[PDB]
């Protein structure tokens, strides 16, 4: 439930400590945790909102010039002087102009020309700093079992750096503990929150401090004092005797195309919600019980309400209806071939499925992990057991290949933290994580200023180079290539 | 540009493709993609369904080019002569015909 | 401005062509509208600035 049709869900089957399992939660997908004697729990990261951000360095992307004025002096006089030069609201430019004997000033040198124009902004795109505080993640939990196809079965957990660990109380199943690392989630304190006009982005610090436009730091109020005062004003020169001042228009689509690779975000009220990120929680499943065990089996007839649908990952979802009234009772369900000898084949990724209500007709939804062959879903005890025919396509080799592909993509997206997905914890895992940290730091220092054009080019170049360099560096260049080009074709 | 009333149309994994009636209108921008669907969402099957979104397009600012043939170009040549003119009549443009 | 041909034809912006009669008809239209696909579930449309 909440994970079935997600198409980017991952199974964290396994718990070698009888306890906590590490799990990295992402905005895209969700995680189903299935332990030995514990109910399957579906966990998903839903929203991360940022609130009361401080304001830093608003930029001006649409300027406007108010009133121009100018001054000239004949060729051997001081310099052109405008009283508006000492005013810090005016852009002033000084140049040389042809003068003499026609302009009423008798000498034929070059004269000085000063033009000043008042500067007035508009729009003022603003960036804001995201501190580790004032940041909050929301995690939704659901529990497999008695739930109908459509609460005590679902929970919501708020995690902020002020309260990194929490417990979700699932009535009857106990409570699931989450000990989480909010501060090291997406490496904020390098990211600013940028708004232009009712559109908001997550943007890098360096990109925001390297953008050429009039700017002023701090919160705005009244008429600000704009800095640089150019890159929006152009002093063009006429036929060697005039100066004209123009402004460049609105600079907004230029910024929109400059912001390629920055994350969108949507703000409601003061709080702005991001739609992409990641977090890392450790799941203490030592107070998780099974609500169902110690229930007698149901002895009645079941019906198939809709069908046994197939999810994208191969698991079957079955929705059953119960006709008897035995109260809370176990659902006898299995995956079998050879109806003569009902030998359980496959795995049931559901609880010791139970019907909760005690009425005439109740409903149930359970999901199963069938074997790759043809099989039958067998529900019921004897002489009333409904069965459904079900066929699964893949093979174990294809499944292992797809698992390696998913792991590779997770690594490309999540750097070293990728090693914390099934992080139950040994010495091979920690060694792999350490050497991955080292190689990732080196790779981010050397490469990592490139964006799928630069990377594809330099990858093909290192490919050829390592192919023909004829030394022991062949392997080095081929591995650097493979890293780069896989990082690319992951997409 | 300026955008306007968006709309969308979605279909179950095993159906055709989504179609809005506003795709037969040359004033709307429409995009078709694949969306996770199934059972919970309300359609019973679990593949990728098809989603179409359309939005009305309007232009609030425009920009125009114009062709220049090498005829109907007029040049204005100004001519002056030395001799009797005094310094004042260097940058004076007046009834030069007289 | 005075502009060269082949700079005014290789421009990626929605273009009418010549005769403006009534409700204009912009030929391109995919150079100013961005369809961002949210997370699995939806689609959103924005315009560039």
């Amino acid at each position, epitope marked *: 439930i909440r994970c079935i049709g997600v198409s980017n869900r991952d199974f964290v089957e396994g718990m070698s400590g009888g306890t906590w399992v590490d799990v990295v939660l992402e905005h895209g997908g969700c995680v189903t945790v299935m332990a030995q004697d514990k109910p399957t729990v579906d966990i998903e990261l*839903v*929203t991360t909102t940022v609130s009361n951000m401080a304001e830093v360095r608003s930029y001006c992307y649409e300027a406007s010039i108010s009133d121009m004025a100018s001054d000239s002096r004949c060729p051997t006089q001081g310099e052109a002087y405008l009283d508006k030069q000492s005013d810090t609201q005016y852009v002033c430019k000084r140049t040389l102009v042809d003068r003499g004997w026609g302009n009423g000033c008798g000498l034929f040198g070059k004269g000085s020309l000063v033009t000043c124009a008042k500067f007035a902004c508009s729009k003022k795109m603003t960036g804001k700093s995201i501190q580790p505080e004032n940041l909050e993640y929301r995690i*939704m939990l659901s529990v497999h079992g008695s739930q*109908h*196809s*459509g609460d005590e079965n679902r929970a919501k957990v708020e995690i902020t750096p002020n309260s990194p660990r929490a417990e979700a109380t699932l009535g009857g199943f106990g409570s699931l503990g989450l000990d989480c690392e909010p501060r090291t989630g997406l490496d904020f304190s390098d990211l600013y929150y940028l708004t232009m006009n009712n559109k908001h982005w997550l943007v890098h610090k360096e990109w925001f401090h390297d953008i050429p436009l009039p700017w002023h730091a701090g919160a705005d109020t009244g008429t600000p004092h704009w800095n640089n005062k150019e890159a929006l004003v152009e002093f063009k020169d006429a036929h060697a005797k005039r100066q004209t001042v123009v402004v460049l228009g609105s600079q907004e689509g230029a910024v929109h195309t400059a912001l390629a690779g920055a994350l969108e975000a949507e703000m*409601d009220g003061a709080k702005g*919600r991001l739609s992409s990120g990641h977090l890392k929680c450790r799941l203490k499943m030592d107070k998780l019980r099974l609500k169902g065990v110690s229930y007698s089996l149901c002895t009645a007839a079941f019906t198939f*309400t*809709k069908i046994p649908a197939e999810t994208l990952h191969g698991t079957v979802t079955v929705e059953v*209806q119960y006709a008897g009234t035995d109260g809370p009772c176990k659902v006898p369900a299995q995956m079998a071939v050879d109806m003569q000898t009902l030998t359980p084949v496959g795995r049931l990724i559901t609880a010791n499925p139970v019907i909760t209500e005690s*009425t*005439e*007709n109740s*409903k149930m939804m359970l999901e199963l992990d069938p074997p790759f062959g043809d099989s039958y879903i067998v529900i019921g005890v004897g002489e009333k057991k409904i069965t459904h025919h079900w066929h699964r396509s893949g093979s174990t080799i294809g499944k292992a290949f797809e698992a390696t592909v998913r792991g590779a993509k997770r690594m490309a997206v999540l750097g070293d933290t990728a090693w914390d997905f099934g992080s139950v914890g040994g010495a091979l895992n920690s060694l792999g994580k350490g050497i991955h940290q080292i190689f990732g730091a080196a790779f981010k220092s050397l490469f990592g200023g490139m964006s799928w054009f630069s990377q594809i080019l330099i990858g093909t170049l290192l490919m050829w180079l390592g192919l023909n360099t004829k030394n022991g560096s062949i392997s080095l260049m081929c591995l650097a290539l493979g890293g780069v080009l896989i990082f690319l074709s992951t997409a | 540009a300026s955008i306007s009333d968006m*709309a*969308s*149309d*979605s*279909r*179950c994994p095993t*159906q055709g493709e*989504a179609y*809005l009636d506003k795709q037969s209108d040359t004033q709307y921008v429409c995009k078709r993609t694949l969306v996770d669907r199934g*059972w*919970g*969402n*309300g*359609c*019973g099957l679990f593949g990728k369904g098809s989603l179409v979104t359309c939005a009305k397009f309007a232009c609030s600012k425009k920009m125009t080019g114009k062709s220049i043939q090498p005829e109907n170009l007029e040049y204005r040549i100004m001519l002056s002569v030395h001799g009797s003119q005094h310094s004042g009549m260097i940058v004076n443009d007046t009834g030069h015909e007289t | 401005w005075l502009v060269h041909k082949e700079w005014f034809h290789d421009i990626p912006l929605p273009w009418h062509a010549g005769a403006d009669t009534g409700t204009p008809h912009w030929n391109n239209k995919e150079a100013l509208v961005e369809f961002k696909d*949210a*997370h699995a*579930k*939806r689609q959103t449309v924005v315009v560039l600035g």
Partner: antibody
Amino acid sequence: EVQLVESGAEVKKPGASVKVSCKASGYTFTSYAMHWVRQAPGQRLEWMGWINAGNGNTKYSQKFQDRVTITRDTSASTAYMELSSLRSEDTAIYYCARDKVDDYGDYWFPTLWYFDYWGQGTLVTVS
Amino acid sequence: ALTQPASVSGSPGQSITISCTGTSSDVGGFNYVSWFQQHPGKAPKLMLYDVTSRPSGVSSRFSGSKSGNTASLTISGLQAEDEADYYCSSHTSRGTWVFGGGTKLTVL
């Protein structure tokens, strides 16, 4: 428990505009979307539109696209529907119904049980 | 928008069926089919959602079925307190709601 209560009945001459509220109680108002359904006397029900009380997005039917405006007041837990340019056909009963909004805060897909709770109704008489 | 029979009558103690025919965009493609019961004076009450599924405090006599473009509500064991208006509703593919014409059930 869940209780949606609308304003009392109202009589308006044609050409005027009606504004009917729907106060919600017994649940978190910010996490639900309110639909407005009109029922003519002894006729079918007519869906007019909905408003997501969380962020404020709205969607109206094609039949009322340019005649109805739905707004909300979270602090007061109210949803208002205003219909302008009344006609004799608009003499009908107006109901408000809740529907759960997705956990991401968006209302793209409705939940299977859309109109689990309704309002008692409000008769608008166009004379 | 949804084709529903004008009226349906049945003697107390027998089953009866009310059909609801739609198109391939509202009832044909989606399990978004709901049945509402409305006694005169009161507001409609959700009797069935998700086609077959029904809420908690609803008698198990009401059943739902769907074939192609036609949904169907079945009332087995017609009781006294069943004379009301029954409306089928569906969430279309374009994101709008459509209701049925209406059926007045008479228990006689």
